[model samples]
Target: PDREKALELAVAQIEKSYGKGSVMRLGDEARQPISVIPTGSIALDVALGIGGLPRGRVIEIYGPESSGKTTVALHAVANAQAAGGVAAFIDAEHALDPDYAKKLGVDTDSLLVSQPDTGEQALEIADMLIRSGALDIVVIDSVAALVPRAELEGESHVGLQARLMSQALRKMTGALNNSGTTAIFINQLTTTGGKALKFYASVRMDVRRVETLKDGTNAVGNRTRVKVVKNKCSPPFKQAEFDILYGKGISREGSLIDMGVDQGLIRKSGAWFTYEGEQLGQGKENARNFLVENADVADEIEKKIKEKLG
Candidate 1:
């Protein structure tokens, strides 16, 4: 066999190690973390559907500075390490702020943080690390930084860049997904508009800032919406409302429960649950409305806990 045969054999074996189909993961020689992973945030895992984000997908957490992007990223690392799993942080374009590192309780000693100057470098580092089989979760900071400007300039390579970047992300995810690990990517969003194809992220969240008016009640105030922008998974859109308490991202949970509908009745139960003893006459609508309002209240509390360290 010639050199070509040797090269093919090497690459094919590598590909076989990180297969793309269901359960494509291989053994971890380093004893790194090709292990079962737990949600970075156990509570969040439940909210996003028990078991958390899938291994084969790219989860984009996009928001401005102080919008809690790094805070959450660090938390993910801490969570992975807490699960006795090795994690990586691809610090794309110098955006890796260590300010909240201690606050998030991350086990920095067991984590790998790559300081890459460009998206290309970050992708290369991430792919290499994953293929090396030494990580359980990898969180890349800011997709905007990972993507080249030319790719944003509407070049023919835009799609290629997207596919390549996505492939790189997938390589990291696939190994863990196959072997039962987790990967998360953090991206900064460009205002107005961006390449629609970038929506390729598995679970995408858009965080925004807003002025919240306080209401006099047990309720805290209006919500600062953290909308779930792109979700291909089986979960409903979730919003977070908080009362900014002492800077440093301190906040409390809050939601507004609208007054019940006056004199309302329901003919039949909607697409939701239908108990046999369900009321079918007057007060049916009121009963449904009451549950809706209360459920919203409960969710508001859960969102607050999720946004902060509890």
Candidate 2:
């Protein structure tokens, strides 16, 4: 003992002071800070609770046309790269436009773009990249287009398709997480009962467009809503709103400002990015490249989702 005399005092004092579970809030009680990527829309990120896209698990954004689905997903890529993490977007639907992505905040040069001619090709590329452990995060852009991998019958083809795709998505996400990478699946919503069988995740975001009257004007409110359908280290409840400006970066307000993803950051249905004033800015290169190259993903997503949803 360096000094046996001073023994029990320090331990006793610490025991008296600290609570059992509050050593640090959930996000910081680990080897690394819980990763939360930026949503292209700030309001969407807020509704997500723990505030960024997931750091170590899976997130799925589900919605329909012009619902701002791709915008939010692209935003996440930019945010992840900003945090010094590499991301892979498995463009299964062949709808990725690098220039459009660049306009939002994703850096195409640093991002891996896998253009798969078929669903199997996309999955093959995804499995290779994810298991190779070269990436910190990986995204499967929209699970709706992987038709060749599905088993069909004479009943409810759409429902059956959604279920099969969801299951495949689940398998992929499990693989990604096993390799210490976070997986995000951009999904298309097909619902009579509002559930897609295998395509769900711990974190789910839905982007929908609604009409609203503001500033004495009737306008179409194109925003993304994210919900923690399931998650660890974050409570699940209440959807968050996010901005989806077509060519600009995603944020909570009209101007570019970070409305964080923690529930505590909630103020009138939004979370705060309480990184102690560490608000991240979406990078220009990343956004620009996304817009230019990933047009294929967007185009396919727009086409297939409309057909299925109808």
Candidate 3:
């Protein structure tokens, strides 16, 4: 009884000197409710519940070919750079397009792109990078392309590769939990049933291309659907659908309109948008221009998207 009382008194004194609850509270904020990194899509972010990419956790993006997996990661990367955070894009598939990333608003100079020869190399490098505690976001582009060292060396296919990959992820979980890093792992959807990464990920999303917009037999855009298969930070199965045009970026104006209409910020009647007693025409080209022309109204709507969604 005396020893217990003595220990309590010592703890109280330590906390008192450091301000209450400061002692033994190293990285306490990391354990608490961490903030989400904005993905630059209002609808997608809102659907994520916390309004963006989750920090201190693994987010897996798996999909078919040309399903906009890299595109989505670039959005989050761009937003992270804009928020003054450095990012690393570990291009295991040798698919880091700096020009496209720059066009998407990513600070390519601030991004560190590395091409690893094997899965072990990539994960080992990533483990080091995460331990550095410098990057705010680390994106491993498409894990399906990462060749296991054993497979590359042709030593043996004795299932050692799987063990290495799993070990890397297990180590990453500890690093992620202790630091303020958001790690995104991209993987290709396979018919086979080994979803090892999904088991370790805090959030899992499936990207699918539903429709393609074509102009005279030329594909111009893709209407992609991002469904949250498992989200530790939000409700599962919440989905967001949007279009990504070829030349132009994601139709921000379209998203704003959808959000405004849903939130009652703007009223939609037939083919017109009514805002503050002013009606605007609704056309493919006119929508964006109309929003830009009416800066006062559009500004508020944009602000509302950030406020409400975030």
Report every candidate's CA lDDT: 0.50, 0.55, 0.75
Candidate 1's C-alpha runs over 4 A off are 1-46, 147-160, 166-173, 190-200, 211-224, 242-310
Q: Give lDDT tens digits, candidate 3, residues 83-113.
A: 8888998887776777877777889987888
TM-score of every candidate relative to the true structure: 0.54, 0.60, 0.82
Which residue pairs come into collision in candidate 1? 142-186, 143-187, 223-241
* RMSD to native, candidate 3: 7.9
Candidate 2 residue lDDT tens string, 204-278: 665676543132454433444555554443444546555455456353333122222222231222232222243
Give the number of the best model, judged by lDDT: 3
Give the higher-lDDT candidate: 2 or 3: 3
Instruction: For candidate 1, give the lDDT.
Output: 0.50
For residues 30-59, write the lDDT of model 1, one tens digit per residue. Answer: 111223233333333433442345554556
- Backbone Cα, N, C clashes tallied per candidate: 3, 65, 0
